[PDB]
Design a protein around this ligand. Structure first.
Ligand SMILES: [Cl-]
Ligand SMILES: [Cl-]
Ligand SMILES: [Cl-]
Ligand SMILES: [Cl-]
Length: 129
């Protein structure tokens, strides 16, 4: 599923991501925009053989099991396929764990490079939320 901007904002809020660990909803929308272009089915292989999955491009090196990332962990206790669902529940639960791990949203390199410090409220501008 390819979400729209306000539709994704709405879904994130419903799943309690808005202001989670102090990160406003526009930060989460912005991260999703640049990690996956709002496509739940996004996958990208990393040079180290891990893969990033879903709307927030969660990495199999630590957070989910894909069966093909040797030496990896599965700290969200989920198959990485669950992260490609049209329903964002698994991605959201996992992102909560990720953003609580110590470095906040810096875990998401696109968020650090493209969202951090910017006018992130623009991402929820005009949305009925
Ligand atoms: Cl957009
Ligand atoms: Cl594995
Ligand atoms: Cl959803
Ligand atoms: Cl980047």
């Amino acid at each position: 599923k390819v979400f729209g901007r306000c539709e994704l904002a709405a879904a994130m809020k419903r799943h309690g991501l808005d202001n989670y660990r102090g990160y406003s909803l526009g930060n989460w929308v912005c991260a999703a925009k640049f990690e996956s272009n709002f496509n739940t089915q996004a996958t990208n292989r990393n040079t180290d053989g891990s893969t990033d999955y879903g709307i927030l491009q969660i990495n199999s090196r630590w957070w989910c099991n894909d069966g093909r990332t040797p030496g990896s962990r599965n700290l969200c206790n989920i198959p990485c396929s669950a992260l490609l669902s049209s329903d964002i529940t698994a991605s959201v639960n996992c992102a909560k764990k990720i953003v609580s791990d110590g470095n906040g949203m810096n875990a998401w390199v696109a968020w650090r490079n493209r969202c951090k410090g910017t006018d992130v409220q623009a991402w929820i501008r005009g949305c009925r939320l």
